[PDB]
């Protein structure tokens, strides 16, 4: 019933793990790939969809300098939430400053 699997490199290596994100596509995995690549503790972050008939993405996160790849994945999720909350705030504050000039101009 869960919707994230983690597939290690050799059962012991925790730097490379390929996250299998169930019920996603290039909507999330292209913007996660954008955030995790902004982390200088990542040698390699890329994604692929497994097969278009399927509904999951593979996400290879490959960390240099002794970190597990759960930390760039969590940081790239929170660091995308903190993009979208701010985009939501500056969008709900420019719709409001447009309705407050459509109305309060000549009416």
């Amino acid at each position: 019933k869960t919707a994230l699997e983690m597939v290690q490199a050799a059962g012991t290596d925790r730097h490379c793990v390929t996250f299998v994100l169930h019920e996603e596509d290039h909507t999330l995995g292209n913007s996660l790939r954008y955030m995790i690549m902004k982390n200088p503790e990542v040698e390699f972050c890329g994604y692929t969809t497994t097969h278009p008939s399927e509904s999951k993405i593979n996400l290879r996160i490959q960390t240099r300098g002794t970190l597990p790849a759960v930390e760039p994945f969590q940081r790239g999720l929170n660091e995308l939430m903190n993009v979208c909350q701010h985009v939501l705030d500056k969008f709900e504050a420019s719709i409001k400053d447009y309705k407050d000039q459509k109305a309060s101009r000549n009416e």
Partner: protein, 309 residues
């Protein structure tokens, strides 16, 4: 370079250009293509709506069939707010107050007695011969008469030609609206089309004068290059490079493909969100930003449930 959050909270701005009913056009300065495409692709296929799923016929004695009528009804925008409703749980044909809506399209067609002498105009000869979408009686079920006003659960347009009838010919069906996203079936998509484009910059590398400026003003879309007089000569300058359709017609001209540098401006998108009317376009974009967040919340919840330590 790393992700400076105060470089994003300093160089991001949404500039709304034109917003009215069932349309919106705005900017997003300073955002890369991987988040902008995520917003576009959640507007088209992941922001949910209500749409007709099951049709219950009795006496479809019409030329429009029993199947094409049902598919044609499913593509009709229903003006119920999606967020008040849940997904109908699977394997449940009968619905309840939370999941389903019901309409009823009951139209008979009978000959017109009056105002019909020696004419052939069809409105004067028949009554109910164009089944429009204002013929859908909302049959409220359970306790939905109290949650919603009299005349809010409604087809959006009320001018859509469903069928076309003749005397004797009847439609008596009943519908069941459900909730879904625009990936299960594209009758659930709330947007006409949501799309973005970069902002063009047109740079005159050389001062154009005289008979070449009027040639340059017609190689772009009407509105871009204005040709105004400055001491006897007709110089040309750029003016609203946003209007340029980027058709590259100036690179067909040999004398003037060396006096423009037609390119684009990085990360200066211009969206355009046209709704089908189910929700206004400023709530579709907010409920497109608020679905990418939920996709990011669900996976952090999964990681919190996986590791205990």
């Amino acid at each position: 370079d790393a992700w400076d959050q105060d470089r994003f909270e300093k160089n991001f701005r949404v500039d709304v250009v034109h917003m009215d009913e069932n349309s919106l056009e705005f900017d997003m300065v300073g955002i890369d293509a991987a988040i902008a495409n995520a917003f576009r692709r959640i507007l088209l296929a992941e922001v949910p709506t209500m749409a007709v799923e099951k049709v219950l016929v009795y006496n479809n004695t019409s030329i429009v069939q029993d199947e094409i009528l049902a598919h044609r009804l499913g593509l009709i925008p229903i003006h119920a707010d999606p967020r008040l409703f849940e997904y109908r749980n699977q394997g449940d044909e009968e619905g309840t107050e939370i999941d389903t809506l019901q309409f009823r399209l009951q139209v008979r067609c009978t000959r017109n007695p009056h105002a019909a002498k020696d004419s052939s105009d069809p409105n004067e000869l028949y009554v109910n011969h164009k089944v429009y979408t204002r013929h859908m009686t909302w049959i409220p079920l359970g306790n939905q008469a109290d949650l919603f006003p009299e005349g809010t659960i409604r087809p959006v347009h009320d001018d859509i030609l469903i069928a076309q009838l003749r005397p004797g010919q009847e439609i008596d069906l009943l519908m069941h609206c459900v909730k879904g996203i625009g990936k299960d079936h594209a009758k659930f998509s709330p947007v006409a089309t949501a799309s973005y484009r970069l902002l063009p910059d047109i740079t005159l590398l050389e001062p154009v004068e005289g008979e070449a400026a009027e040639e340059l003003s017609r190689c772009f879309s009407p509105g871009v290059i204005e040709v105004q007089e400055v001491q006897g000569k007709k110089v040309a300058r750029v003016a609203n490079p946003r209007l340029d359709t980027f058709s590259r017609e100036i690179f067909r001209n040999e004398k003037l493909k060396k006096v423009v540098r037609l390119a684009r401006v990085r990360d200066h998108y211009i969206f355009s969100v046209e709704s089908t009317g189910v929700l206004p376009p400023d709530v579709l974009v907010s409920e497109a930003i608020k679905v990418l967040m939920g996709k990011c919340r669900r996976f952090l919840d999964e990681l919190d449930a996986v590791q205990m330590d």
